[PDB]
Design a protein around this ligand. Structure first.
Ligand SMILES: NCCc1c[nH]c2ccc(Cl)cc12
Ligand SMILES: [Cl-]
Length: 273
């Protein structure tokens, strides 16, 4: 079984997502992350193409699993009496974006542009696979430090992507849009763009722009750090109060601030190595 297939290493982290351990697949020494999620904490359940009852997280990870390295790859999963165990790929060396920004402070715009571009490509991949992440934030982004490649993790608050209104939300409140705070209603893509605006501000300022519900609703963006006019314009556009005033992913990627992005390897060479 699972216990013989994997060699357990130290705890990497724990929180809303469960408990994640460093591990090694015994057959080929492959680095893995072993995530444990208690059954009593799983509210969203779904079913695989065959019809087995699994957490929605497993459904969403399988839908996004492919060669594309912008999303974490689910290698296997196991059901225990009181929990589900997920075997995920583990880049080495790795650091999540929250720890990275905490240690290094506000990012140089060239670095934020490379990171933000990769997040946008990863989110577009999720949407193309019929998956809405619902918790895009620094803590849910891993940096493969050698390759300069970012990976979205923690699909535990996600949903199947739909074109109708969402009236449920269990992601991070400080990244949630004003329409959710005010009306408990949002559409997937425009709510994702709002969270991307929060994330971009966080990258270039070193902290999130809003703390309280009143600030999210007012949506007044103050820059606490020196940030270029083009970057400020893009952030303020993603953070438009009206969902219809927000840019589409195409408009974000065609924005003047997004031009001449570095390749991930160039990004690692200049900023990470
Ligand atoms: N601080 C992030 C903790 C975490 C959550 N899901 C993961 C998947 C892979 C790896 Cl390497 C780590 C994690
Ligand atoms: Cl994960």
């Amino acid at each position: 079984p699972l216990e013989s297939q994997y060699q357990v290493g130290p705890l990497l982290g724990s929180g809303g997502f469960g408990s994640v351990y460093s591990g090694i697949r015994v057959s080929d020494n492959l680095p893995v992350a072993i995530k444990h999620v208690e059954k009593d904490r799983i509210s969203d359940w779904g079913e695989l193409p065959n019809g087995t009852r699994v957490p929605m997280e497993v459904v969403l990870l399988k839908k996004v699993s492919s060669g594309f390295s912008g999303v974490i790859r689910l290698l296997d999963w196991f059901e225990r009496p009181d929990s589900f165990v997920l075997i995920l790929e583990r880049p080495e060396p790795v650091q999540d974006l929250f720890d990275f920004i905490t240690e290094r402070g506000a990012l140089q715009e060239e670095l934020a542009r490379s990171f933000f571009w990769q997040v946008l490509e990863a989110v577009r991949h999720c949407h193309n696979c019929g998956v809405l992440h619902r918790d895009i934030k620094d803590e849910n982004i891993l940096i493969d430090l050698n390759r300069g490649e970012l990976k979205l993790i923690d699909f535990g608050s996600g949903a199947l992507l739909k074109d109708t209104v969402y009236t449920d939300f269990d992601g991070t409140r400080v990244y949630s849009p004003p329409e959710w705070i005010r009306y408990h209603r949002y559409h997937g893509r425009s709510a994702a763009v709002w969270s991307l605006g929060i994330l971009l501000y966080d990258m270039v300022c070193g902290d999130i722009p809003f703390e309280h519900d009143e600030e999210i609703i007012r949506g007044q963006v103050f820059f606490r750090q020196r940030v270029s006019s083009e970057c400020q314009h893009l952030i303020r556009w993603c953070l438009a109060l009206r969902p219809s005033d927000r840019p589409t992913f195409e408009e974000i990627q065609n924005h003047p601030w997004m031009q001449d992005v570095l390749l991930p390897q160039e990004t690692a060479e200049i900023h990470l190595h």
